[PDB]
Amino acid sequence: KTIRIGFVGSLLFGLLPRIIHLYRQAHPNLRIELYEMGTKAQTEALKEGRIDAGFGRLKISDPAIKRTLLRNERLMVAVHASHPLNQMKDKGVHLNDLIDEKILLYPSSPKPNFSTHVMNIFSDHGLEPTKINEVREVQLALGLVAAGEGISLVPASTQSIQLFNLSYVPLLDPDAITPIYIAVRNMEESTYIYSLYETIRQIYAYEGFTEPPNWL
Amino acid sequence: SVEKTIRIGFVGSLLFGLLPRIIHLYRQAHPNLRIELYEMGTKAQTEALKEGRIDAGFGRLKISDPAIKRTLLRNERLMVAVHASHPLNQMKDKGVHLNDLIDEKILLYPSSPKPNFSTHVMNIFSDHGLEPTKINEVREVQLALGLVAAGEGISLVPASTQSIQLFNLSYVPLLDPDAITPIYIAVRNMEESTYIYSLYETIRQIYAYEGFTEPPNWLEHHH
Numbered sequence: 001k002t003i004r005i006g007f008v009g010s011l012l013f014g015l016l017p018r019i020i021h022l023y024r025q026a027h028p029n030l031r032i033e034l035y036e037m038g039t040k041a042q043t044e045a046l047k048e049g050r051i052d053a054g055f056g057r058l059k060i061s062d063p064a065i066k067r068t069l070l071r072n073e074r075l076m077v078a079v080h081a082s083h084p085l086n087q088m089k090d091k092g093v094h095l096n097d098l099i100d101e102k103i104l105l106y107p108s109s110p111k112p113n114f115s116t117h118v119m120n121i122f123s124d125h126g127l128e129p130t131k132i133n134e135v136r137e138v139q140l141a142l143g144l145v146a147a148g149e150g151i152s153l154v155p156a157s158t159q160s161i162q163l164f165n166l167s168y169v170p171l172l173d174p175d176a177i178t179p180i181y182i183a184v185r186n187m188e189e190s191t192y193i194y195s196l197y198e199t200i201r202q203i204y205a206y207e208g209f210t211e212p213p214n215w216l
Numbered sequence: 217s218v219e220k221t222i223r224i225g226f227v228g229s230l231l232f233g234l235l236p237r238i239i240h241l242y243r244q245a246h247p248n249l250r251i252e253l254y255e256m257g258t259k260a261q262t263e264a265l266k267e268g269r270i271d272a273g274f275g276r277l278k279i280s281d282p283a284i285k286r287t288l289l290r291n292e293r294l295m296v297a298v299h300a301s302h303p304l305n306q307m308k309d310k311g312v313h314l315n316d317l318i319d320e321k322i323l324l325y326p327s328s329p330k331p332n333f334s335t336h337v338m339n340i341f342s343d344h345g346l347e348p349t350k351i352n353e354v355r356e357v358q359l360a361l362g363l364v365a366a367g368e369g370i371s372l373v374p375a376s377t378q379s380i381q382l383f384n385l386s387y388v389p390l391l392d393p394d395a396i397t398p399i400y401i402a403v404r405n406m407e408e409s410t411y412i413y414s415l416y417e418t419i420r421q422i423y424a425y426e427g428f429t430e431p432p433n434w435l436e437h438h439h
């Protein structure tokens with residue numbers, strides 16, 4: 001009678017909480033254990049049975065795991081209000097506008113992680129940011145930006161964090177995205193997981209995202 | 217030069233409030249200076265100050281050590297983070313008292329070594345002979361807030377945490393006058409350098425803009 005759900009910390013700023021809340025309303029008799037962990041930990045947790053569902057942001061594929069893309073979330077650039085890039089907030093900027101800026105990557109957790117994903121997007125277009133500095137967590141990066149130490153690339157849902165003189169600029173490159181996946185065991189056929197799928201679908205319909213006909 | 221390098225330690229929770237704009241203004245007013253910033257707990261800041269790893273530390277705990285001195289900057293109010301549908305959310309505009317929270321599922325944080333915010337919050341309850349039963353320890357503030365938003369319970373948070381806004385997360389005023397969390401600036405127990413006095417001056421400026429009530433002696437003594 002216990003569902004165990006793993007999730008990367010960055011998903012706390014997006015739709016995940018309202019998904020869990022709606023899921024809990026339909027399941028008073030179920031025990032919802034929420035675990036914060038990275039995609040690499042979730043994969044091992046799924047096989048072993050430590051979690052039943054995993055929400056992550058990278059696609060490290062595995063025979064025993066069925067991962068489904070929920071959506072591609074936009075990346076944005078966090079800048080100080082006075083930064084030149086903040087003059088291009090309405091229309092947006094491109095990745096190649098960022099290469100001579102002091103870029104704050106995060107987290108400092110084991111790789112692969114969000115900083116590896118960010119650096120991969122740059123390297124996918126032959127872009128080479130020379131002024132790079134890795135810090136521990138998202139709020140540290142935003143704090144440092146607000147204090148005037150650089151810029152940071154962040155998921156759009158990070159706008160949940162509003163700091164004094166911190167502005168978020170849209171990125172125009174189509175592939176300036178960070179995906180969100182739900183991962184379950186390849187064999188999975190539980191009514192709890194399918195109801196979780198249903199809950200996610202229900203909320204994605206409320207927001208009105210573009211989804212295939214066979215999606216979940 | 218190393219002489220023109222100032223190293224500042226701070227606890228993570230202070231990034232949601234006034235600290236960043238204080239550092240930005242300090243940097244702006246002293247382009248001569250290299251400012252280095254280190255996130256670390258109040259306990260770590262003590263040894264850092266002693267060995268010269270940092271020159272000033274911003275923290276929320278008074279940990280007495282003869283090698284260190286401090287100044288209280290202000291007492292920040294606490295608030296209760298709740299789900300928008302929670303009964304306590306009816307008091308969002310008026311506020312609630314600590315004894316209203318006793319039978320609630322309270323998410324404490326962080327899960328780092330003690331003493332910390334969880335222990336200080338628990339001390340506030342015990343100071344009034346209140347013993348919350350449903351207590352849960354969680355790693356960090358956004359996990360606590362995310363879980364609150366998921367419907368797991370409530371959490372006591374510094375008021376500047378309101379920088380984080382989540383769907384169906386609401387912040388309720390906590391009315392008890394001692395439901396506060398202090399903010400200190402600690403330095404070596406010696407005469408502050410001119411660079412640290414200049415940091416004091418920046419703090420005074422920002423605090424004047426915010427209208428906080430000090431203390432005639434507060435952060436004074438350049439000469």
Ligand SMILES: [Cl-]
Pocket residue numbers: 291292293375376
């Ligand atoms: Cl306050």
